[PDB]
Every structure is written in structure tokens, then in C-alpha cells.
């Protein structure tokens with residue numbers, strides 16, 4: 001495990017990570033208080049599958065609850081009330097065992113942290129911040145979903161649960177918890193939640209103070225049309241918007257540019273995600289994914305959230321693309337362990353590693369065929385990737401002696417290594 005910072009000091013940890021999102025939206029409903037026991041038990045498997053890191057659910061207990069017609073949710077971690085680790089995923093004790101088992105097997109533990117808001121209203125909690133002290137966004141005049149004097153970012157829905165993460169005491173509180181996660185819960189890094197909610201610069205601060213040399217990733221889902229008309233971002237590409245967050249937080253960022261192309265364009269247009277960017281300083285900070293707990297389905301109730309789900313006819317192509325290309329790939333728990341894509345994914349992980357493909361590896365796109373046709377310059381081998389293409393042989397697009405590495409879905413997924 002190579003471990004440095006990128007050339008622009010972004011915390012990509014060697015640019016060689018392969019991450020597993022370790023949960024789906026309905027875990028708290030399907031394996032109540034049993035999730036950490038399940039991970040402990042699966043640690044060796046996760047490690048053998050080839051993952052170098054795992055994105056853990058929020059560790060802070062969440063006993064929230066909501067209902068919206070047929071829709072229902074709560075307890076998943078995004079509306080926590082305390083730093084107490086005895087939540088719906090399992091106890092503190094189990095968490096410790098789980099992180100220890102993962103860590104021992106050589107899988108880094110990345111915690112999902114939610115600094116933007118908390119469950120203000122929860123009656124029995126250990127963290128009680130009174131009103132009128134500047135701790136809350138709503139301590140200030142709250143015009144609309146725009147930064148206010150009590151919160152330098154967007155608000156979460158109503159904004160009544162928004163924290164002034166910039167308040168010296170609120171900042172300090174998060175900072176200590178981050179340090180706590182690293183020293184007693186074996187944190188090798190963090191996934192920063194709802195990043196649009198507070199300044200990017202705060203994320204760099206936090207990382208600097210508690211885990212400067214760790215891995216970090218920001219979850220920024222905000223399209224151009226959500227910025228004010230006068231803002232440059234209102235006219236920028238998805239790529240520019242996320243790259244800008246990354247420059248400021250000094251953390252890799254989820255590639256929502258690739259996700260939007262996967263949902264709205266053709267497979268040939270997948271080349272316009274951050275990860276396909278010709279400048280290595282651009283593509284290396286991209287954290288690729290096919291679906292997450294928000295965008296995809298989940299086993300159980302209501303099929304989870306499925307806000308921007310990738311259709312099944314493209315799941316193999318999508319994994320083939322992310323696992324063989326630049327940026328840092330993320331595998332969704334369900335595709336891997338629930339839905340039967342596990343074998344195919346395992347094969348690609350092996351291909352990626354044998355080729356020595358990394359965050360900054362070069363990628364070239366070949367124009368004369370149908371589908372996506374790309375040449376990837378791994379540090380050990382060159383890969384030719386042809387997805388839903390009329391390409392006949394790797395030699396039509398690259399110099400060298402190629403061997404078939406992968407051939408799935410009636411040749412819709414073809415990968416060759418030199």
C-alpha cells in the first residue's frame with residue numbers, strides 16, 4: 001500500500017485504493033444491531049476479494065424516524081444525536097471488534113462522518129447545544145438555502161438542524177471525535193457527508209488536525225443548476241464543480257460527473273466523467289462508483305432509496321469501466337455480496353491489480369468504433385477495454401501483443417491485457 005499525497009497534496013493515499021462501500025440503505029432494518037458482527041465475520045473475505053479499504057456506516061447512534069406516505073426511514077446514521085457508538089449497526093464493543101478484524105486483514109476502515117447537522121430534537125442524547133450561542137445555523141437570519149452568518153454552506157432541508165461547524169466549539173468537538181475514531185476505532189480515513197453543507201476548507205482543517213496522512217473523500221452531489229445564476233458554477237460542468245471542491249478540501253471527491261453521464265448519456269459519453277480527464281491532476285482525485293446507498297436500490301423495504309439507479313443492463317459495463325480506469329473505484333455492497341456480480345467484480349479487481357492501474361494512469365478513447373473503446377496505461381500492463389462495441393481485435397486500436405482478460409455478456413464486456 002503506497003501511501004502519499006498527490007502532487008497537489010490531495011489525500012488520495014498512494015492513488016492505489018480499491019474501496020468497498022460496506023453497507024446498503026436498509027441494513028438497520030434487515031440486520032438490526034447485527035451489521036458489525038457480519039463485517040467481523042466477513043473481514044477475511046473482503047480482504048481476499050481484493051479491497052484495500054472499506055467505507056463504514058456512520059458510527060454515531062441514530063434513533064431517528066420519519067414517514068412520508070409509503071416511505072419510511074431512520075436510524076441509518078445521517079441524523080445522529082450523539083457520538084455514542086451503540087446504535088442500530090451494533091454496539092461499541094462489536095464496532096471495535098469489527099474494525100480490528102478488518103484492520104488485521106489489511107483493509108483500512110473509513111468512517112462516514114456527518115458534521116452538517118444532528119438530531120437536535122432527540123430528547124435523550126449526550127450532546128446538548130443550546131440556542132442563542134451561535135452553535136446553530138438558525139441562531140442567525142436564515143433567508144434561504146444559501147450560506148448565512150451561522151453556517152457557511154447550504155442547509156439540510158429546513159436548516160433547523162444545521163450546525164455552525166465554523167463555531168470554535170463545534171469545530172473543536174468534531175475534531176476531537178475524529179481523533180477518537182483514529183485512536184480507538186482504527187480509522188484509516190473518512191468519507192465526509194453532505195459536503196455542500198459547509199466550507200471545503202473546513203475539511204482540510206479537520207484532516208490536518210486529526211489524520212493528515214489518511215484517505216478522505218467528499219460526497220458532493222450538487223449540479224450546476226443548483227448554484228445561483230450569478231455563480232460561475234451555474235454554468236460550469238459537473239467536472240469543474242467537483243474538482244473545485246477537491247482543490248479546497250484537499251480530498252478526493254465522488255465522481256458525480258461520471259455518474260451523470262452514466263444516467264443521462266450513452267456509454268460513449270462515459271469518457272466525460274472526472275476520471276477520464278486528460279490532466280492527471282484532474283482524473284486522480286476522482287472517486288468512481290456505480291451506485292451508492294442513495295442512488296441505488298437496496299434489499300428490503302421500498303427497494304431502499306434508488307434516487308438515480310443504474311439499470312441492470314449496464315451494471316457489468318459500469319463495473320468493467322470503473323475497475324479498469326483511472327481514479328479510485330468504489331464497489332457497492334449489494335452488487336458484490338447480494339446480487340451475484342461478486343465473481344465478475346473479483347475478476348476485474350484482479351485485472352486492475354495485475355496491470356498496475358492507479359488513480360493517475362493514462363486513458364485514451366478510440367473514436368472509430370461503437371460503444372466505449374479505451375486504452376489504459378497501467379504501470380505493469382496496457383489494457384484495451386471495449387464496451388458494447390463493434391471492435392474486432394485489440395490490435396485495431398493499440399500496439400502490442402494482447403491476451404483476453406475478460407469476456408462477458410456476449411462480448412459486450414471485453415478486456416485485453418498486453
Ligand SMILES: OC[C@H]1O[C@H](O[C@H]2[C@H](O)[C@@H](O)[C@@H](O[C@H]3[C@H](O)[C@@H](O)[C@@H](O[C@H]4[C@H](O)[C@@H](O)[C@@H](O)O[C@@H]4CO)O[C@@H]3CO)O[C@@H]2CO)[C@H](O)[C@@H](O)[C@@H]1O
Pocket residue numbers: 064065066073074075077078079114156157158159160161193194195219293294305
Ligand atoms: O430536522 C431537519 C429536517 O428534519 C426532517 O428531515 C427528514 C427528511 O425529510 C427525511 O427524508 C430524512 O432524511 C434523510 C434522507 O432521506 C436520506 O437520504 C439521508 O440523507 C443523507 C444521504 O444519505 C447522504 O448521502 C448525505 O450526503 O446527505 C443526507 C443527509 O445527511 O439521511 C437523511 C437523514 O436521515 O430524515 C430527515 C430527518 O429525520 C424534516 O422533514 C425537515 O423539515 C427538517 O428541516
Ligand SMILES: [Ca+2]
Pocket residue numbers: 001002003012013014015016017
Ligand atoms: Ca494506498
Ligand SMILES: [Ca+2]
Pocket residue numbers: 116137151152153154155156162163197198
Ligand atoms: Ca450547513
